[PDB]
Amino acid sequence: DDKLPNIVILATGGTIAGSAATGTQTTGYKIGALGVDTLINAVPEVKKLANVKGEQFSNMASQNMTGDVVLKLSQRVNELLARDDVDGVVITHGTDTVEESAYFLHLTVKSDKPVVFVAAMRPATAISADGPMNLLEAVRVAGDKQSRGRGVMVVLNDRIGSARYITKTNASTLDTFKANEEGYLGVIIGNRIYYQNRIDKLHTTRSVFDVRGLTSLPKVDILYGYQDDPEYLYDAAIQHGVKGIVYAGMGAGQVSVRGIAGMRKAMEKGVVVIRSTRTGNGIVPPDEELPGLVSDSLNPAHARILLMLALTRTSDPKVIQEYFHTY
Amino acid sequence: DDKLPNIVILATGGTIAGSAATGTQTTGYKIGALGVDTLINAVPEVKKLANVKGEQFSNMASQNMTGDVVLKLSQRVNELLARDDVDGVVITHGTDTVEESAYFLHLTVKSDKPVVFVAAMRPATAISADGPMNLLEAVRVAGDKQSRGRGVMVVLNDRIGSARYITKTNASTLDTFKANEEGYLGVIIGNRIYYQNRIDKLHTTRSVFDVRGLTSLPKVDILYGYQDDPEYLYDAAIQHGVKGIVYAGMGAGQVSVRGIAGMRKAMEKGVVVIRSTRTGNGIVPPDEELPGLVSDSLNPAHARILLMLALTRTSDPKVIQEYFHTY
Amino acid sequence: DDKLPNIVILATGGTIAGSAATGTQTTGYKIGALGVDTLINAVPEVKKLANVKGEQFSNMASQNMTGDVVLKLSQRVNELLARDDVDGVVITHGTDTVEESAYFLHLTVKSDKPVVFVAAMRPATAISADGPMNLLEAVRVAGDKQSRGRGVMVVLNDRIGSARYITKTNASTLDTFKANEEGYLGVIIGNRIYYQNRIDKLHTTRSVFDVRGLTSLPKVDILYGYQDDPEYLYDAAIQHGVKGIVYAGMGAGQVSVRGIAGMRKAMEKGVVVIRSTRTGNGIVPPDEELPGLVSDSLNPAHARILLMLALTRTSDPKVIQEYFHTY
Amino acid sequence: IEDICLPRWGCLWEDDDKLPNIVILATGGTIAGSAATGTQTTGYKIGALGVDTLINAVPEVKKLANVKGEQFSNMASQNMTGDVVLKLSQRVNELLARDDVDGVVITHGTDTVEESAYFLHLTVKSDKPVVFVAAMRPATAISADGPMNLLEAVRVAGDKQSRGRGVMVVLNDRIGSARYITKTNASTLDTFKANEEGYLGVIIGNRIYYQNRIDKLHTTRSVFDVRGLTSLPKVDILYGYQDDPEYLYDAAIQHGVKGIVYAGMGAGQVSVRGIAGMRKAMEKGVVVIRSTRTGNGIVPPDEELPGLVSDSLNPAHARILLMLALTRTSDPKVIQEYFHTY
Ligand SMILES: N[C@@H](CC(=O)O)C(=O)O
Ligand SMILES: N[C@@H](CC(=O)O)C(=O)O
Ligand SMILES: N[C@@H](CC(=O)O)C(=O)O
Ligand SMILES: N[C@@H](CC(=O)O)C(=O)O
- The span from the first CA to the last CA of chain D, in angstroms, equals 41
Q: How far is CA A127 from CA A13, A81, B308, in A?
A: 20, 35, 39
Q: For residues A244 and A305, is the Cβ–Cβ distance under 8 A?
A: no
CA D263 to chain centroid: 19
The amino acid sitting at B152 is V
Q: Which of C224, B190, C181, A160 is nearest to D184 (CA)?
A: C181
Distance CA A28, CA B290 (A): 9
Provide the CB-side half-sphere exposure for D47 (13 A, CA): 5
Cα-Cα-Cα-Cα dihedral sign, residues D54, D60, D63, D64? negative
Q: Is C63 within 8 Å of D269 when comparing Cβ atoms?
A: yes
Nearest alpha carbon, ligand 2 atom 1: B61
Q: For residues C74 and C44, is the Cβ–Cβ distance under 8 A?
A: no
Ligand 1 pocket mutation, candidates A63, A101, A135, criterion most atoms within 8 A of CB: A63
Q: Which of D148, D193, D188, D145 is nearest to D169 (CA)?
A: D193
Q: C70 — phi, psi (to 5°)?
A: -60, -40
Neighbour-count burial for D54-71, b at 16+ CB within 10 Å, e otherwise: bbeebebbbebbbbbbee
Look up residue B62 and give its DSSP letter.
Answer: G
Q: For residues C94 and C63, is the Cβ–Cβ distance under 8 A?
A: yes
Distance CA B229, CA C280 (A): 42
Of A172, A301, A304, the CB nearest to B283: A172
Which residue does chain B place closest to D173, by CA atoms?
B173
Q: A109 — phi, psi (to 5°)?
A: -80, 120
Find the helix packing angle between A232-239 and B232-239, rounded to 10°. Answer: 140
Q: Is B283 within 8 Å of A62 when comparing Cβ atoms?
A: no
For chain B, helix (H) and strand (E) counts, in that order, are: 9, 17
Q: Residues in chain C, how many?
A: 327
Give the containing element (helix H, strand E) for A48: helix A46-49
Q: Is D213 within 8 Å of A196 when comparing Cβ atoms?
A: no
The amino acid sitting at C172 is S
Q: For residues A206 and A153, is the Cβ–Cβ distance under 8 A?
A: no
Distance CA C150, CA C154 (A): 11
Strand partners, B187: B159, B194
Q: How was this structure determined?
A: X-ray
**Which residues of C fall within a CB distance of 8 Å from B183?**
165, 179-184, 197
Q: Resolution in A, one decimal?
A: 1.8
**How many angstroms separate the CA of residue D15 from the nearest CA in chain C?**
40
Nearest bound ligand to CA B279?
A: 1
Distance CA B119, CA B65 (A): 14
The amino acid sitting at D320 is I
Give the containing element (helix H, strand E) for A73: helix A67-81
CA D87 to chain centroid: 14
Strand partners, A241: none
Sorted by where each starts, the structural domains of chain C and their CATH numbers stand as 6-206 (3.40.50.1170), 220-326 (3.40.50.40)
Residue B250 Cα to ligand 1 midpoint, Å, equals 9
* Whether B22 is catalytic: no
Distance CA A29, CA B243 (A): 31
Q: How far is CA C105 from CA C62, C300, D272, D284, in A?
A: 15, 17, 24, 40
B95 marked among binding-site residues: yes
Q: For residues A247 and A266, is the Cβ–Cβ distance under 8 A?
A: no
Distance CA B140, CA A260 (A): 38
Q: Which of C162, C120, C167, C160 is nearest to C144 (CA)?
A: C160
With a 6 A CB cut-off, is A60 part of the ligand 1 pocket? no
Q: B46 — phi, psi (to 5°)?
A: -60, -30
Neighbour-count burial for A106-137, b at 16+ CB within 10 Å, e otherwise: bbbbbbebbbbbbbbbbbbbbbbbbbbbbbbb
Q: For residues D263 and D238, is the Cβ–Cβ distance under 8 A?
A: yes
Q: What is the 3-state secondary structure (H, E, C) of B153-177?
A: EEEECCEEEECCCCEECECCCCCCE
Q: Is C175 within 8 Å of A174 when comparing Cβ atoms?
A: yes
Distance CA A193, CA A186 (A): 7
Other C-beta atoms closer than 10 Å to the C-beta of B41 total 12
List the alpha helices (DSSP H) in C35-97: 36-42, 46-49, 67-81
Which residue does chain D place closest to B25, by CA atoms?
D205
Q: For residues A115 and A105, is the Cβ–Cβ distance under 8 A?
A: yes
- For the purposes of burial, counting CB atoms within 10 Å of the CB of B44, is it exposed (0-12), middle (13-18) or buried (19 or more)? exposed
Gyration radius from chain A CA atoms: 20
Q: For residues C238 and D245, is the Cβ–Cβ distance under 8 A?
A: no
Q: A181 — phi, psi (to 5°)?
A: -90, -25
Q: D173 — phi, psi (to 5°)?
A: 75, 10
Which residue does chain B place closest to D135, by CA atoms?
B128
**How many angstroms separate the CA of residue C189 from the nearest CA in chain B?**
7
Ligand 1 pocket mutation, candidates A29, A39, A96, criterion most atoms within 8 A of CB: A96
* B160 CB-near residues (< 8 Å, 6+ apart): B141, B153, B154, B184, B185, B186, B187, B188, B193, B195
Q: For residues D46 and D109, is the Cβ–Cβ distance under 8 A?
A: yes
Residue B291 Cα to ligand 1 midpoint, Å, equals 17
Residue A155 Cα to ligand 3 midpoint, Å, equals 25
Distance CA B172, CA B178 (A): 13
B307: helix, coil or strand?
Answer: helix
Q: Residues in chain A, how many?
A: 327
Interface test with A, best of B96, B100, B277 (most A CBs within 10 A): B96
Q: For residues B97 and B301, is the Cβ–Cβ distance under 8 A?
A: yes
Distance CA D134, CA D126 (A): 22
Look up residue C138 and give its DSSP letter.
Answer: H
Q: Is A254 within 8 Å of B66 when comparing Cβ atoms?
A: no
Of A169, A232, A283, the CB nearest to B236: A232
Q: Which residues of D touch B (CB under 8 A)?
A: 37-39, 41-42, 58, 60, 137, 141-149, 151, 172-173, 186-190, 202, 204-206
Ligand 3 neighbours, Cβ below 6 Å, are C 13-15, 31, 61-63, 94-96, 119, 121; D 266, 269
* A99 CB-near residues (< 8 Å, 6+ apart): A154, A163, A166, A167, A168, A299, A301, A302
Angle at D9 between CA D5 and CA D12, to 5 degrees: 45
**Which residues of B fall within a CB distance of 8 Å from D149?**
128
Look up residue C280 and give its DSSP letter.
Answer: S
Look up residue A5 and give its DSSP letter.
Answer: P
Look up residue A50 and give its DSSP letter.
Answer: -
**How many angstroms separate the CA of residue D127 from the nearest CA in chain B?**
28
Q: Which of D238, D236, D276, D259 is nearest to D332 (CA)?
A: D259
Q: For residues D110 and D136, is the Cβ–Cβ distance under 8 A?
A: yes
Q: For residues A211 and A73, is the Cβ–Cβ distance under 8 A?
A: no
Cα-Cα-Cα-Cα dihedral sign, residues D44, D50, D53, D54? positive
- The span from the first CA to the last CA of chain C, in angstroms, equals 38
Of D213, D297, D312, the CB nearest to A200: D213
CA D80 to chain centroid: 11
Distance CA B58, CA C153 (A): 45
Which residue does chain C place closest to A176, by CA atoms?
C175
Q: Tally A–C CB contacts below 8 A.
A: 76
Distance CA D123, CA D118 (A): 9
Strands (E), chain A: 6-13, 18-19, 30-31, 51-60, 88-92, 115-118, 153-156, 159-162, 167-168, 177-178, 186-189, 192-195, 197-199, 220-224, 244-249, 272-277, 293-294
Residue C94 Cα to ligand 3 midpoint, Å, equals 4
Of D42, D240, D319, the CB nearest to C287: D42
Of A182, A187, A285, the CB nearest to D205: A285
Which residue does chain B place closest to D39, by CA atoms?
B191
Distance CA B171, CA B158 (A): 19
Strands (E), chain C: 6-13, 18-19, 30-31, 51-60, 88-92, 115-118, 153-156, 159-162, 167-168, 177-178, 186-189, 192-195, 197-199, 220-224, 244-249, 272-277, 293-294
Q: Which of B58, B65, B99, B68 is nearest to B308 (CA)?
A: B68
**Which residues of A fall within a CB distance of 8 Å from C23?**
45
Q: Which of C37, C52, C41, C36 is nearest to C143 (CA)?
A: C52
Q: How far is CA A156 from CA A184, B69, D311, in A?
A: 11, 45, 20
Q: What is the 3-state secondary structure (H, E, C) of chain D?
A: CCCCEECCCEECCCCCCCCCEEEEEEEECHHHEECCCCCCCCCCEECCCCHHHHHHHCCCHHHHCEEEEEEEEEECHHHCCHHHHHHHHHHHHHHHCCCCCCEEEEECCCCCHHHHHHHHHHHCCCCCCEEEECCCCCCCCCCCCHHHHHHHHHHHHHCHHHCCCCCEEEECCEEEECCCCEECECCCCCCEECCCCCCCEEEECCEEEECEEECCCCHHHCCCCCCCCCCCCCEEEEECCCCCCCHHHHHHHHCCCCEEEEEEECCCECCHHHHHHHHHHHHCCCEEEEEECCCECCECCCCCCCCEECECCCHHHHHHHHHHHHCCCCCHHHHHHHHHHC
Indicate left, alpha or beta for B243 from its phi (over 0: left) and psi (-120 to 50: alpha): alpha
Q: Is A183 within 8 Å of D204 when comparing Cβ atoms?
A: no
Distance CA C21, CA C24 (A): 9
Q: Which of A100, A96, A64 is nearest to B256 (CA)?
A: A64
* A311 CB-near residues (< 8 Å, 6+ apart): A218, A220, A243, A244, A272, A320
Indicate left, alpha or beta for A185 from its phi (over 0: left) and psi (-120 to 50: alpha): alpha
Q: For residues D57 and B128, is the Cβ–Cβ distance under 8 A?
A: no
A12 marked among binding-site residues: no
Distance CA A97, CA D83 (A): 53
**Which residues of D fall within a CB distance of 8 Å from B189?**
186-188
Interface test with D, best of B24, B27, B118, B128 (most D CBs within 10 A): B128
Nearest bound ligand to CA C225?
A: 4
Distance CA A27, CA B271 (A): 25
Gyration radius from chain D CA atoms: 21
C215 marked among binding-site residues: no
Nearest bound ligand to CA B12?
A: 2
Q: For residues C33 and C15, is the Cβ–Cβ distance under 8 A?
A: no
Distance CA A180, CA A281 (A): 7
Q: For residues C54 and C9, is the Cβ–Cβ distance under 8 A?
A: yes
Residue C282 Cα to ligand 3 midpoint, Å, equals 26
* Break positions in chain A: residue before each gap, C to N over 2.5 angstroms: none
Q: Is A250 within 8 Å of B285 when comparing Cβ atoms?
A: no
With a 6 A CB cut-off, is B251 part of the ligand 1 pocket? yes
